[PDB]
């Protein structure tokens, strides 16, 4: 220990800690707190300048009442009592914040699945007296698989309970139950009463303040797909087109909303999917000034020029070389002649003749720029310059996560100094209607059912479809029975599933791998673990989580749990060879020692000859081969086993028969339907037998 | 805490072996990558990739027949919820 310490330049012994105990005990605790801070690195892709309204979506059982709850929150943030709230509504709550409420329907899983893909923040109210109904539990399960939003539960009906002691016990139970579903340490606010038609100001003020500092995290799906919520719905058709064609037309439709997530590209012709209608495409993109402008934002606009009464927006409810390049009339011959004043199939570009080049390249003095006391100083400087060129990349944080995070942060403001130079005209096209730009994008070929049966109470979103997602191939996913759901899932039995922006029923098939040598189909689902599966439908990215359900018609629910199948997707192709095992049974009719004659497995003596040399096995576990087609009866054959087969014994020849995937596809089209609950698709195998009275 | 890089031993035939249980996780605080048992093979259904796992010390007392020495670690929680809570169907995996 004497010379080991002295090896370093500084005295090793001189630097020491007064307490070993405190240094050591504190060191472990501090490190655990840090490791906890570290999380895998992500990308935001939401603008620093103009953020969209963070969508907050009240959900829950219907008899509790969420309409009166949202009216007691907008009347304490804008001091303007509302009435008969329907559809999405935007209110400015702060100097830079402005949330957008969205009353879900409680009755419709078709909209309950729809909303959780877009709700940035979800407010869940569970009746204090009735605890958690199925609709709350069903919504929480679907939200978690797609991507967990920030949840802030609340507990109405707290006032009713007769005894405070019983009420305190009930509050602890719900609080503890809520912790398991969400994250422990999260407490749902409790509202005592609605005597005046609104909650107490003190309880509401705490709830409004708690929501304001939410600071929601970035979901993976939302930073890959440009999405928006439709503020107001507008049909733009001539009534003369309607009166002539007689209500059969597909209507030209303008829709209005705030963009989100990623920049929706402004060249018209990107395809984009209404949740619950079908795959559409954009036709015209226009941006108009947002109705609700933050006061800090308004001040900047006023200063450049040199709205207090309306603090909310509820429309549904009642009150150069480059510009020489991108023209197509110019020829590229003319383009360079406009710039000064050939096929790409050959690889070597057009040079001049060696006569013209050798006379030009006698001297290399034009290109010598690109190669590598006062006088002495100069020399030194030169050397330094060369040293930097010779060893610059090799020569040029404490935690790896912080560094690799700098790969994102430096990547952010190198967009921003790039976009800033463009900004008035070039940036908008390059910007492509960035998130929160209140855009007017119009459609075409929207069906007649959508405008007729419409009510503003249900939402409608858009999913900017990636070119990956636009096709239709059979996908390899894996999934399990959702362990709340009682019955197990069946192969080739239709299942409504929400994959990507789309909701649809398809015919899955549940395919294990017999120790990774093939894809054998099962007939059912392994009732407690993930099985590898397959189904036709739209295509997506791999590592996309979906969450499939059974009967989504609210006419037929019962008290069972609705969500039945959850899982991710592994890979996608257009053909999976998929194998059902079949075995050919046979019986011996004359045995010997070590050689059998087996009957009625093969029909003809020619059928045996297609199969000779096949490794036959028995029930008893002995092996063998089948060798020659016996002639004088048409069916039988001689087969040599390894030991004396019995008469009581049943030979089985393993074999594999390929199957197919049935290519049924059915988007749910929920709000094209009139009643908009009780959309009934393909029935289950058990249900059809009862209807047709088969056994 | 660590990030699931990939799942070792998926191609093992013999179920609930020792080669099968291994996942290869890189630690977040160092970037060192390391292998860890995930107990009772049916658990492997819960971990996928990039799934924020807590590693612990495995620390067996006496060697088994087929164990792999050098598997230092065991996986306890994944996405914040316990594997033994998952395996007993108490909680569900958040995403």
């Amino acid at each position: 220990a004497k010379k080991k310490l002295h090896t370093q330049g500084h005295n090793a012994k001189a630097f020491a800690v007064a307490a070993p105990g405190k240094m050591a005990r504190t060191m472990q605790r501090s490190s655990d707190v840090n490791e906890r801070k570290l999380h895998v690195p992500m990308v935001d892709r939401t603008p620093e300048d103009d953020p969209p309204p963070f969508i907050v979506a009240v959900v829950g059982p219907p008899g509790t009442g969420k309409t009166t709850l949202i009216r007691s929150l907008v009347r304490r943030m804008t001091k303007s009592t509302l009435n008969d709230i329907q559809g999405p509504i935007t209110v400015v709550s702060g100097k830079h914040r402005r949330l957008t409420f969205l009353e879900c329907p409680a009755d419709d899983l078709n909209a309950m699945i729809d909303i959780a893909k877009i709700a940035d923040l979800v407010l869940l109210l569970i009746d204090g007296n009735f605890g958690f109904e199925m609709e709350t539990m069903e919504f929480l399960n679907i939200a978690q698989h797609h991507g967990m939003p920030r949840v802030l539960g609340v507990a109405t009906h707290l006032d009713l309970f007769k005894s405070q002691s019983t009420l305190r016990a009930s509050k602890k139970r719900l609080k503890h139950r809520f912790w398991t579903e969400v994250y422990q340490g999260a407490k749902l606010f409790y509202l005592s009463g609605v005597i005046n038609g609104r909650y107490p100001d003190r309880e509401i003020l705490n709830l409004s303040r708690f929501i304001s500092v939410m600071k929601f995290r970035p979901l993976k799906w939302r930073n890959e797909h440009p999405y928006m919520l439709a503020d107001r719905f507008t049909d733009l058709t001539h009534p003369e087109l309607i009166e002539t064609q007689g209500l059969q037309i597909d209507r030209k439709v303008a829709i209005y909303g705030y963009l989100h997530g990623t920049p929706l590209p402004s060249a018209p012709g990107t395809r984009v999917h209404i949740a619950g209608v079908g795959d559409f495409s954009v036709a015209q993109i226009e941006k108009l000034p947002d109705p609700c402008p933050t006061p800090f934002y308004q001040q900047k606009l006023d200063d450049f020029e040199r709205d207090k009464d309306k603090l909310i927006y509820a429309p549904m409810s009642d009150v150069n070389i480059g510009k020489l390049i991108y023209m197509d009339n110019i020829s590229p011959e003319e383009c360079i002649r406009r710039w000064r004043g050939v096929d790409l199939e050959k690889f070597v570009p057009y040079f001049d003749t060696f006569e013209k080049l050798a006379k030009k390249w006698k001297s290399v003095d034009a290109i010598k720029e690109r190669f590598l006391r006062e006088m002495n100083a100069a020399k030194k400087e030169k050397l330094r310059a060369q040293f930097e060129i010779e060893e610059g990349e090799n020569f040029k944080y404490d935690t790896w996560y912080e560094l690799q995070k700098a790969k994102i942060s430096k990547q952010l403001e190198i967009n921003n100094i790039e976009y800033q130079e463009m900004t008035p005209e070039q940036r908008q096209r390059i910007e492509g209607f960035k998130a929160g730009s209140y855009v007017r994008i119009v459609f075409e070929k929207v069906p007649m059912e959508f405008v007729k049966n419409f009510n503003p109470k249900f939402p409608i979103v858009m999913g900017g479809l990636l070119p990956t997602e636009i096709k239709f191939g059979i996908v390899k996913a894996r999934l399990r029975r959702h362990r709340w759901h009682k019955k197990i899932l069946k192969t080739n039995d239709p299942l409504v599933l929400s994959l990507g922006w789309r909701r649809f029923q398809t015919l899955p098939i549940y395919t294990t791998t017999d120790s990774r040598t093939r894809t054998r189909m099962l007939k059912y689902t392994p009732e407690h673990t993930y099985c590898n599966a397959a189904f036709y439908g739209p295509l997506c990215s791999p590592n996309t989580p979906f969450c499939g359900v059974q009967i989504v018609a609210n006419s037929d629910t019962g008290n069972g749990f609705r969500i039945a199948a959850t899982g991710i997707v592994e890979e996608i192709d257009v053909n999976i060879e998929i194998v059902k095992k079949l075995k050919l049974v046979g019986f011996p009719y004359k045995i010997f020692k070590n050689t059998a004659f087996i009957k009625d497995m093969f029909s003809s003596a020619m059928e045996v000859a297609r199969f000779e040399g096949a490794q036959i096995k028995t029930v008893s576990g002995i092996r063998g081969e089948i060798k020659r087609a016996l002639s004088k009866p048409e069916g039988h054959y001689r087969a040599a086993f390894e030991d004396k087969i019995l008469m009581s014994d049943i030979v089985i020849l393993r074999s594999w028969y390929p199957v197919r995937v049935k290519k049924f596809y059915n988007p749910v089209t929920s709000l094209l339907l009139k009643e908009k609950t009780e959309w009934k698709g393909l029935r289950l195998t058990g249900q059809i037998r009862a209807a047709m009275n088969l056994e | 805490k660590g990030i699931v890089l990939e799942k070792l031993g998926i191609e093992s035939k013999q179920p609930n072996s020792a080669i099968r249980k291994c996942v290869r996780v890189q630690l977040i605080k160092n970037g060192k990558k390391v292998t860890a048992f995930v107990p009772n093979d049916g658990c492997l259904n819960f971990v996928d990739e990039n799934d924020e796992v807590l590693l612990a010390g495995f620390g067996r007392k006496g060697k088994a027949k087929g164990d792999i020495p050098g598997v230092r670690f065991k996986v306890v929680k994944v996405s914040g919820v316990s594997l033994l809570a998952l395996w007993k169907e108490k909680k569900e995996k958040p995403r």
């Binding site: 040598t517 040399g613 096949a614 | 070792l8 031993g9 191609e11 093992s12 080669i19």
Partner: peptide
């Protein structure tokens, strides 16, 4: 003909198997 396929692939799916196993054990 199916004998010469069923044998040859099964030999490949074992000769590729021990390589993929022994590449695990040494690492």
């Amino acid at each position: 003909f199916e004998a010469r396929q069923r044998i040859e692939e099964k030999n490949k799916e074992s000769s590729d198997y021990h390589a993929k196993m022994a590449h695990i054990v040494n690492t």
